[PDB]
Amino acid sequence: FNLKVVLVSFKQCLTDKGEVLLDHYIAGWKGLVRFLNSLGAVFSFISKDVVAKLQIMERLRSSPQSEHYTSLQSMVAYEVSNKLVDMDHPRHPHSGCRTVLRLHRALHWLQLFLDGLRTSSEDARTSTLCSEAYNATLANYHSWIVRQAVTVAFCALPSRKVFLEAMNMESTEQAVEMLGEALPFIEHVYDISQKLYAEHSLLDLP
């Protein structure tokens, strides 16, 4: 196992029509969770939640409706057109649309964090890299108590070297090189998803 193989799921999930394939999206996140877990327990407040939502998506994708959950685009077209998603402030609490929204937001945090990890000085402060990434993203969807608790938790995070080493590349430098190759794919998937959700007024699904 290694992070390069994991992030390549996000290159693979993209079609030449600009669609995001659900199956590779799930697999990329399954790998990211495995990575987060290899760094202790500081991330379980994100990781445990991410895993539960992935299970929700796998059940949708294995379902008799499987053809509809083939891509994020087809999911949205289907769930909206058949009124299967709660747009306001609830009859469908586990819809694909609202579930992927959380994965999407958490993915934004994970992308900025990994990119911060990549461009930083050697002995850079992990709690800091993470905290800037979080405040830019997930913090906008958490409560004061959560933001405060989480921000303190970041101080228990391993060193940058322990992070890069956890990526299981041949070397620390190679890991940094790998991130520069991979993140653009993660970002593109995020941008496509964000636009898709924006254009359908799904950015605040309950």
CB 13 within 8 A of CB 192: no
Residue 123 exposed, middle or buried by CB count within 10 Å (0-12, 13-18, 19+): exposed
83-112 burial: b if 16+ Cβ within 10 Å, else e: ebbeeeeeeeeebbbbbbbbbbbbbbbbbb
* Structure-token pair, residue 53: 């939502």
142-177 burial: b if 16+ Cβ within 10 Å, else e: eeeeebeebeebbeebeebeebbebbebeeeeebbe
Was 102 annotated as part of a binding site?
A: yes
Was 98 annotated as part of a binding site?
A: yes
For residue 160, give Cα distances in angstroms to 28, 42, 113, 129, 183.
Answer: 22, 15, 11, 10, 18
Was 49 annotated as part of a binding site?
A: yes
**Which DSSP letter does residue 159 get?**
P
* Structure-token pair, residue 194: 């964000």
Q: What is the dihedral of CA 174, 50, 44, 180, to 10 degrees?
A: 20
Was 142 annotated as part of a binding site?
A: yes
Binding-site residue numbers are 49, 53, 98, 102, 142
Binding-site residue numbers for an N-acylsphingoid base 1-phosphate are 49, 53, 98, 102, 142
